[PDB]
C-alpha cells in the first residue's frame, strides 16, 4: 500500500513503554563531562588519611625559629 498516511499518527501511546532495553548502553559518552560540579564536596573524608608521607619533608623551614623557649 503506497497510499497510506505517512504522518506520525498523533493519537499514539505517549506513556513510558516499560519494555525498553534496561541494560548499560555500552556506546555512551566516555569523556570528562565538563559541566560537572566544580565545588568542595562537603561530605569528603574528614579523617586523618593514615597512608600519608611519613618521611622527613626535606624542604622545610631551616631558619632560627625566633619564637623559641628563651629560658634555661
Amino acid at each position, epitope marked *: 500500500d503506497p497510499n497510506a498516511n505517512p504522518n506520525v499518527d498523533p493519537n499514539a501511546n505517549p*506513556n*513510558a*513503554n516499560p*519494555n*525498553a*532495553n*534496561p*541494560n*548499560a548502553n555500552p556506546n555512551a559518552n566516555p569523556n570528562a563531562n565538563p559541566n560537572a560540579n566544580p565545588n568542595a564536596n562537603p561530605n569528603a573524608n574528614p579523617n586523618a588519611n593514615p597512608n600519608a608521607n611519613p618521611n622527613a619533608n626535606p624542604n622545610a623551614n631551616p631558619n632560627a625559629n625566633p619564637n623559641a623557649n628563651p629560658n634555661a
Partner: antibody
Amino acid sequence: VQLVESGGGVVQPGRSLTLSCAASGFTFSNYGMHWVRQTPGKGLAWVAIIWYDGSKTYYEDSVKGRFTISRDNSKNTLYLQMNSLRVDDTAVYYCARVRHSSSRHGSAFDLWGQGTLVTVSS
Amino acid sequence: IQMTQSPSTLSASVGDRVTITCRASQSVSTWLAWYQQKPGQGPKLLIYEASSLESGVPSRFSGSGSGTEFTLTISSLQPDDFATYYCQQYNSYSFWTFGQGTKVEIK
C-alpha cells in the same frame, strides 16, 4: 558467573520480609534485573524490574505499593522489600538478568538464580 | 497477553521428535522466549526472539513463528531433555507474562 538469593523463610500474614540477591562473576552494575515468582500449580509470574540504575521500577498490578525492589551496585546485591504479606504470596522467588540486546527493546531472562522459598501462613 | 501452551503434557522417548505449541491472545510480533526448567532448579533460557539460539544451547533445540502462533521443535530427544518448557513474551508495550508450562515425560 552465578546468581544466588537469600532471605527466605516463613512469616505471619501482614509481616514484612526482605529478600536479597547477590550476583558474582560478572559486572553486576551493567544489567537490569527482575524478580519472578513460582506458585506451585501455576506458571511463573513476573513481580518487579530494576533499571540498571534504580531510576525506573515497574511492578505487577497485584503488588504495587506492597513490594519495593531496589539494587545496590557497590555490593552486587538486589533487594525486594515485601510489606503487607498475604497468604497468596507463597511462592519461590527467582532473580533474572536481562540479556544484552542490540536494540531498544530489551531481551529475555537468561541467568536465573536457584530461588528462595517464601511461605506465608498462620 | 495470556499465553496458553498446548499440549499440556506430551510423552516421548529418546530420539523422538517433540513439538510444543505456544499461542498468544494478542500479537506479540517475534518477541517471545522459551525456557527449560528441570525439577528443583532455576529455568534456563533456550531461544530468544523465537528464532535465535542462546549461546551454549545444543543445536537440537529450534523455534519458529511470528504473531500469535509459535512452536518449539526438538529434532532428537535426549535423556537430559526431559524437563518443563515455558513460553514467555515481552511485547513492545506489554509486560512479561509466562505460560503454563508443558512437561515432557519418559514413555
